[PDB]
Amino acid sequence: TRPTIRPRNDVVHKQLSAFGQYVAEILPKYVQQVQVSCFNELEIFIHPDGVIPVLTFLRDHTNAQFKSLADLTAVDVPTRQNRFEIVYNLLSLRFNSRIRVKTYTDELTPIESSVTVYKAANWYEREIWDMFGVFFANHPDLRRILTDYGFEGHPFRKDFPLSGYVELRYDDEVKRVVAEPVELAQEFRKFDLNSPWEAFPAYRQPPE
């Protein structure tokens, strides 16, 4: 591994593995999987019912005390039965470490709101609802935060079109801004960039 290759830290990998095993042991009721990546990141996979217990444990426990909510977001994977996965990123100032917690849901199953655990989660859950349509139960005030008033649909879903369905302009007859079906003078050009001759053998999937 000469200078063009990224250096690998063994000590952090072992520490994160040990802490993941520790967290898995303490909460067997919810934790489903623990992973440590080759660039020293620890993410924990839990059941949806354990969002509040796991987050409260990670925030309040003396050994964890992850007091800072770095980010909360969602990822849309249409091929899964549970369409959306919910990702929590946490930072610990006491021990100078970062942890990730992943959850899953679909269109109709609500997720428990974590505003009681982290005050920062309010606007993040509002944005998740606005962009993906994931409902959060017991939220103080859940409503759109980014889309226009009266906007229909959720744009960050994979089946939503890039340019949407309606566009805006000014009409002199009605003397106001109106919404009409979208027509583009030049259609967005779609490029097929993926090549054959796979790049990374280490990620090859079984031929099923």
Binding site: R169, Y170, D171, D172, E180, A185
Partner: protein, 297 residues
């Protein structure tokens, strides 16, 4: 049909409707609505103008890129008319002045200009022509307005046999002079009026462009209800919450509206005329700081 003029798209802002229309006098009250209706469906509009471009600025957002073209012209020259209607297949005449200027009298405005426009359009091969005159345009009219309108209608029909004559009846709208003048006063019981909505006239013109059998026909655009002048002004003042142009306009407004049941109207163009009761608030809400008028049928 010249393939580049074949309709395409879904009838939207960036579609192609196959209409290249020249709208003379498009900077007026009806011109803006005509240009807007033509541009919202993807047709190209050539806007001839004599006014400062600043006064034509409001027509810029009515069409997509390249779909609206502004050219300078004057009525006393035929070369400008030729170069404006050279490539158009539809020509609409909306030129008209309600008063008399020192350089353009009613004769020039309503006889010589429409005749020259029709002659040049016929010589250039323009397929369709739409001309606008008044409903009360009769040769023996006391007012010079309607006399000149009748003479111009006759000469246009002579010059362009396939032209369509449209006779609206004292159009009212947001930028009209009917309701605005009646609300700016702050005689009657013998004069009956027949107001017509601006959007109805615009849709009628668009349909006449689209309608194939309306080539040499003459249309009368009239509203749903006939009103006596006194109670009409009463209703106008009541809407505005208010307590109750030199020589020609007063004798034209005291004059009654004609009735020509033989001429086709808006209903033959598939338009349900909107009653004045719906748009009275729209027009007169700005004059402020229920009991509709009685009609005769």
């Amino acid at each position: 049909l010249h393939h580049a003029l074949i309709p395409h798209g879904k009838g939207g802002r960036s579609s192609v409707s196959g209409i290249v229309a020249t709208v003379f006098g498009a900077t007026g009250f009806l011109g803006r609505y005509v240009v807007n209706h033509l541009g919202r469906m993807g047709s190209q509009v050539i806007v001839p103008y004599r006014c400062e471009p600043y006064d034509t600025m409001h027509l810029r957002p009515m069409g997509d890129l390249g779909q609206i073209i502004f050219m300078e012209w004057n009525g006393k020259d035929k070369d400008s008319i030729r170069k404006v209607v050279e490539h158009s297949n539809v020509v609409i005449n909306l030129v008209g002045r309600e008063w008399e200027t020192k350089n353009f009298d009613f004769e020039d405005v309503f006889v010589k200009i429409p005749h020259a426009i029709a002659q040049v359009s016929k010589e250039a091969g323009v397929e369709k022509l739409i001309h606008i005159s008044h409903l009360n345009a009769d040769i023996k009219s006391p007012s010079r307005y309607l006399r000149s309108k009748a003479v111009g209608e006759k000469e246009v029909r002579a010059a362009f046999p396939e032209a369509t004559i449209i006779k609206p009846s004292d159009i009212f709208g947001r930028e009209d002079r009917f309701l605005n003048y009646f609300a700016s006063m702050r005689l009657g019981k013998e004069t009956v009026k027949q107001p017509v909505y601006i959007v109805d006239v615009s849709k009628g013109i668009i349909n006449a462009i689209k309608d194939p059998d309306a080539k040499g026909k003459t249309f009368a655009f009239v509203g749903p209800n006939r009103y006596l002048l006194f109670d009409l002004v009463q209703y106008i003042f009541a809407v505005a919450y208010r307590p109750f142009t030199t020589r020609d306009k007063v004798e034209r407004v005291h004059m009654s509206d004609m009735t020509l049941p033989h001429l086709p109207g808006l209903e033959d163009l598939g338009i349900q005329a909107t009653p004045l009761e719906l748009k009275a608030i729209e027009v007169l809400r700005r004059h402020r700081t229920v009991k509709p008028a009685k009609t005769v049928n």
